[PDB]
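Dock palmitic acid; give full complex structure.
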Amino acid sequence: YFQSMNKFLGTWKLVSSENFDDYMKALGVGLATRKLGNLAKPTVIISKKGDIITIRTESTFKNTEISFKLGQEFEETTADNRKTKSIVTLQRGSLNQVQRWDGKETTIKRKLVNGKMVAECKMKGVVCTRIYEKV
Ligand SMILES: CCCCCCCCCCCCCCCC(=O)O
Ligand SMILES: [Cl-]
């Protein structure tokens, strides 16, 4: 008995964001960029072709896209142009992404709560919560 991330598949629209400014600060994002980041209301599209999962983020300010297999480290360029070594895992219904770069670490845990996808973003004790609804 192995679970899957099929429940994450689809198109997701940001409906709420809490503490994103301080999470961006902790990541090293500069003020002008945080201002635009805070105003962004992205769409996130999670798809899967065979073993390969893709997470595409679309906003006016920044589009990003990563493609990966579960549990295999990949190189990632983030929305704020960090170049990280990343791994996405599935832990008891939660799709967990860890990004490491320059001896630093941040985690984005995405889980489903009453049909909404909730992304918890952590960097050195700063926690940001972002809520998405399925389109
Ligand atoms: C497209 C996202 C907002 C744009 C702001 C760019 C500068 C900082 C963003 C980097 C961290 C993004 C983490 C998003 C987590 C998520 O909700 O999927
Ligand atoms: Cl397929």
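Observed: Residues 49-50 surround chloride ion (ligand 2) (CB under 6 Å).
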